[PDB]
Amino acid sequence: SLQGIHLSDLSYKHAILKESQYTIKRDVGTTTAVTPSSLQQEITLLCGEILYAKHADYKYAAEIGIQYISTALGSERVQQILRNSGSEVQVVLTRTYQMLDIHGVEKSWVEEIDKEARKTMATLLKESSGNIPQNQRPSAPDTPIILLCVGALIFTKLASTIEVGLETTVRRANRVLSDALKRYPRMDIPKIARSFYDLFEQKVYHRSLFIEYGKALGSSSTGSKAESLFVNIFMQAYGAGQTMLRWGVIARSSNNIMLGHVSVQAELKQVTEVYDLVREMGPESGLLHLRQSPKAGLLSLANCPNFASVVLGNASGLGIIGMYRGRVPNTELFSAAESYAKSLKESNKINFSSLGLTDEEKEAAEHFL
Amino acid sequence: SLQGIHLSDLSYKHAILKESQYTIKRDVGTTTAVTPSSLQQEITLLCGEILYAKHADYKYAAEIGIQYISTALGSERVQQILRNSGSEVQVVLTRTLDIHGVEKSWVEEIDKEARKTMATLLKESSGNIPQNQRPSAPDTPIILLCVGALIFTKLASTIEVGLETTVRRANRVLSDALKRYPRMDIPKIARSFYDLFEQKVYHRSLFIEYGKALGSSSTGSKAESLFVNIFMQAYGAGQTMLRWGVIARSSNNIMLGHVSVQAELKQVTEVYDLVREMGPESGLLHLRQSPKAGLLSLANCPNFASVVLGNASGLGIIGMYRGRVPNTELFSAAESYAKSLKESNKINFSSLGLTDEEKEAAEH
RNA sequence: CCCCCCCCCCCCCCCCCCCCCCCCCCCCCCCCCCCCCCCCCCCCCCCCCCCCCCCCCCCCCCCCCCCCCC
C-alpha cells in the first residue's frame, strides 16, 4: 500500500544543469598563443630541441606542445574549440623573427632552448664523426608527439596530486617511451611533466583542447607509432575519478555475497540512479572529471556509504585496492567483503553450465584429475 | 535488484573517436614522389632492372615499387588517397626517370649495372634472352611489390623477424620469378620496404588501396593474384589473440569455464562486439598503424588470455608467440586439456544425421 | 395524447519552513607464431505418338396487401 514514496532526485539534479539557457563568459580578458598550420615544421623542430638537449628551464615546454596541437587541429579552428569550452579567452597567432615568437613565451626562453640544443648537436657531431642519423635529430617528425605523450601521462593522473602524477609519469614513461629515450636521452621527463601539470591547472581550456586532439587523432586512417601510443595513454585515462563505479561492476562480477547485505540492499535505488545517470550522459560521462567539469561529481557514491564499503572490501580482497585513499564508512562490511573476495581469489571452479557441452564431453572433462 | 551495475565503457571509448568533428593535418610541409599513369612502361623497366642485376645499393627499391602503384592507381588520384589517410603531404610528379626524393645517381647506377649484366649474359646465351628473363617483362613490378607484401604481413613484429619470414616464404612463393631473375636480392629489397613503411606511414594505406583495387579487378595476372593472396594472410594483423580466442571456443576448452575466466566474460564480449561495430576495417587497423587500434586489446581480461594461449600451446599452434602469460596456472591446465583433445578421436552421430542402418554399419 | 411529487446553496478547523554532508585519491601502452592458391574426370543428344466422334430447348403451381387498441 506504501508505494508512491519515491523521489528521482539525481535525475532532476542533472536535468537542472541542462535548463541553463544562459551561457557563462569566463576568462574575459585572457589571451593564449595559437600557431597556424603553416608553421608545423618550425614548432616540430622546437619540440625536438626540448628533448634533444639538457636545458636549464622547462617552463614553457607544455605551451610548445599545445602549439603543435594548434598546427595539427587548425590555424584558427582552435579559437572555436576554446570559445565552445566555456572560456571567452582570445587567441594570438604566433609569428616569425629564423625563430618563433610565441605569445606568452619569453623570446629569451625560445633562444635559450635553440642555443643549448645547437651546442649539444655540435658536441655530439664531433664524437659521432659527423654521423647523426635522422631518428636522433630534433628534426624527427615524431618529437612533438613524444613531448605530448609525457603530457598524456600527466593527463591520466590529473585526478590526484601534482606530485602523485610525476611518480606515475616517470615510472610509465621509462617503459612506454623506452625507444624515444634511447634517441633523446636528454629529455627531462620530470620537468616536462611538471610544465604540463602547471599548464593543465592554469589554462583549464587547454584540457578540452588536449581532449579534442585525442578525439581527432583517434579518428585518422593512418597514425604514427608515437601517435598510436598517445591515444592508448589517453584511453587508460577514460575512467577518470570514477574508479569507484568501475570497482562497483567488479564487485558484481566477483558475486561478493556482501552486496546481498540488508544495509547494502537498502541503498540499491541510489546506486542504480548513479549508473543510470552514466547512461543518461553517455560517452562524455567518463571524461567529465578529466575536463574538470563542474557538472562532474553528480557521479558520487557518497549517497551509498555501505555499498562503497563493500566495493572497496572486494577490491582489497582481490588485491586491486593498492594506494586508494577512498574513505571506508562501514569498516565491518569492508572486512567481510574482503574475506569473501580473498577466499574467492584462491578457489578454482568450473562452470559446465556456461560451456554448454555434450554429457560425453562433460563425461571426459570429469576424468581430468 | 542488483542489475543496473553496468558500464559499456569500451563502446563509449570508441564513440569518442567518432565525435571528432575536427580533422588532423599532420605532415604539413612533406613531399613524396608520384608517377603519372603515362610512365607505367618506364617504371616497369626500372623495376625489372632492380631484379635483373646484382646491385650495390637497394635503398630506393621500395620507392620504385610505390611509383608503379602510383601509375596503376592514378596520375593524380594518389594525392587524394594520401590526403584522405590523414597526412596533409604534397605530391611531386616525376619527370623524364627523375623521381622525387630518389637520387639521379642511384637511377643511373641501377640502369648502368643492369645493362652491364644484360651484355655479359647475351654474349653467353649467344644473343638469345627470352622475354620472360628480361627486365622488360610486365610482371617485374608485381614481383618487386610481392617482396613488399611479405614484409607488409610481418609489420606487426621486428624489422628483423620480417626479413626471416620474407626470405623463407619468398623462396617458395616467388619460386619461378627467382628462376628468371636469380639476381634479385630479396633481403635488401625487403629492407627498403620496411624502412619505407616505417618512414612514410601514409604509404601503408596507399599499399592497402592498391591491394583493395587489385582485389576488385575481373582479370588479374598470375603475379597479381599472388600479391593479394599474400595481402590476405596479412588481414588478422595484431589481432592474433582474438582469432586464437575463437579457436579456444571451437576446441571447447573446459578452462573457458573457470570461475576467474567467467568473471571476464563481459569484457571479452565487449571486444568481439567492437570488431562487429567497426566491421571490415577492424582487421587491417593494426596494419595501417592506426591510432584507433589497440581498443581491440585483451589486456582487460588476463585470465582469458592465459586460457587462449594455453589452448594454442596444447594444440601446437603457439609457435614463436612472445605474448605474456598472466596466469601460468590456467595456461598449463588449458594446455593439458588441449593436448588430450588433440590426440583423442570421437564421432558425433548426432551431427551427421544418418539413418540408423548407416549408423548401424558405422559401429561395425 | 403526453404530462401530474418533493426540493435553493452554503455554514469547522488550519501558515510554511527549521538536521547533517564538497567531490576526488590504485594500477596499467599496444604489439610479438605459421601460412600463396591451384592440380582428377566429363560434348550433348538418340523411343513412341494428329486430335475429334453419345445424348439433351428451356418453361409449365398458387398467392394483392391491409384490417385492434392507445
UniProtKB/TrEMBL annotation, chain B:
InterPro entries: Pneumo_ncap. Keywords: Capsid protein, Helical capsid protein, Host cytoplasm, Ribonucleoprotein, RNA-binding, Viral nucleoprotein, Virion. It is found in: Host cytoplasm; Virion. GO terms for molecular function: RNA binding. GO terms for cellular component: helical viral capsid; host cell cytoplasm; ribonucleoprotein complex; viral nucleocapsid. Its main location: host cell. Encapsidates the viral RNA genome by forming a left-handed helical nucleocapsid that protects the RNA from nucleases. RNA replication depends on the availability of soluble nucleoprotein. The encapsidated genomic RNA is termed the NC and serves as template for transcription and replication. Belongs to the paramyxoviruses nucleocapsid family. This is Nucleoprotein. It comes from human metapneumovirus.
